[PDB]
């Protein structure tokens with residue numbers, strides 16, 4: 001790793017300027033707050049956390065996993081700082097969530113680009129499960145996009161050996177099959193371009209459109225992101241089938257990640 | 269809480285042998301425990317009563333207040349009656365009418381070698397409990413802690429609900445409840461688990477069982493990997509296959525993952541009636 005001074009990280013983020021980028025500040029996202037930092041002629045992403053021992057276990061746990069798991073579809077952790085700070089490679093196209101809601105006037109992702117992203121995301125989850133890690137916080141905000149819109153998973157604070165959470169996950173069980181479920185919600189966001197939860201929407205939870213469509217109260221067509229041109233019905237119907245399976249209430253009925261990989265590959 | 273009596277903490281302490289924590293069975297005063305306290309055997313006016321001594325602190329007082337608030341509104345054949353309360357002393361206490369046959373959980377687990385409940389009594393108890401829940405929902409309340417431990421049994425094995433501390437106007441909780449939604453369809457879900465307890469005589473959770481949650485046998489049975497008859501409580505001799513399957517059918521409907529696909533309480537009552 002690299003070691004970073006809290007002093008140094010403070011200066012390269014303009015003293016952790018919490019104003020948004022779109023104002024001339026340094027904040028890129030929050031959930032922890034992620035800042036844009038400038039080191040020499042390179043750009044980095046600095047997450048600064050905000051019980052406190054819970055924060056500490058998460059801080060620690062993220063570093064433990066990052067040390068072991070390195071992969072093309074995982075965000076690289078350059079370094080650390082001990083407030084607690086984590087330093088990552090900057091991902092120029094930001095989060096899946098940002099691009100899906102077309103933040104900052106970026107053009108909508110194409111269907112072609114969304115399938116590649118679904119596939120890269122699944123590849124990253126597979127690497128984790130292959131090495132007996134469970135992510136526990138898979139979501140649109142935690143999938144990041146490099147210069148080529150390659151998907152990379154991040155935010156391992158909760159990794160171990162609401163809108164996104166499986167029933168058993170909510171019951172407190174720890175299973176890689178909960179990652180699968182969460183990934184299902186991500187796939188619905190990818191298809192619809194809608195947020196996983198919307199207090200003013202019906203239904204409030206995106207995962208619930210699965211029931212609407214099963215009851216024939218809606219159709220997939222009713223929900224497809226109207227902002228893309230290249231979405232053929234077949235492949236969209238195929239990604240949905242994947243999401244539907246992933247969202248099964250019983251963990252045992254959900255496909256494992258390798259099977260999800262195969263299905264997403266057959267899709268294209 | 270003007271409909272109730274205010275009791276001195278000292279007098280409750282006196283009549284529970286100073287809240288003697290050893291079990292009734294060895295001459296102590298503890299009858300049960302769990303939800304925010306311990307329930308002791310006590311007396312008022314030479315009559316046996318149940319005394320719950322509550323055990324943060326401001327959440328506790330609010331649950332204390334909430335239960336008194338709710339008992340003041342809700343009186344019914346299938347709800348436990350509150351006699352009074354104590355808050356003057358070192359701990360908050362709630363004093364209830366004594367329920368001689370204890371909790372449904374005690375009786376299903378055959379606590380202290382007591383005989384198994386017959387199938388006909390399990391049916392009376394399932395109907396009584398549903399009737400208590402109907403009364404709550406009719407009066408626009410949500411119980412939020414329906415479980416076999418909170419269904420008590422009088423001399424006639426008449427089912428009476430209690431523990432209203434969480435009432436609003438993990439092994440038991442529906443998916444949407446775990447997400448912090450508050451809806452009466454969640455009580456239905458919990459009641460579904462209770463119905464499985466009644467059919468199987470198994471605890472809602474067993475850390476050492478497969479599956480660990482009784483909820484999960486539903487998936488096992490639908491797969492035909494196991495049958496109802498595999499799980500039926502083998503200690504009753506009067507359980508006929510038709511009505512057992514009918515009760516299981518009701519439980520299975522209550523345990524639908526989606527709340528809008530569950531029967532409301534009146535439908536549950538009808539289905540239970542059509543069983544008997």
Ligand SMILES: COc1cc(N2CCOCC2)ccc1NC(=O)c1cnc(-c2cccnc2)s1
Nearest residue numbers: 028029045075088089090091092094095154155
């Ligand atoms: C919101 O995130 C970003 C936004 C942008 N945009 C781009 C367009 O202009 C406005 C901001 C750029 C980059 C990023 N992020 C990164 O570079 C990250 C690297 N690792 C990270 C992480 C995130 C969460 C939890 N754990 C780790 S984020």
Ligand SMILES: COc1cc(N2CCOCC2)ccc1NC(=O)c1cnc(-c2cccnc2)s1
Nearest residue numbers: 292299300318348364365366367370371430431
């Ligand atoms: C476990 O409870 C009992 C056990 C027994 N047995 C009998 C046989 O020997 C051993 C103990 C008797 C009675 C009771 N209970 C009552 O009488 C109750 C009246 N209100 C109640 C309550 C319970 C919870 C939360 N809130 C209220 S308890």
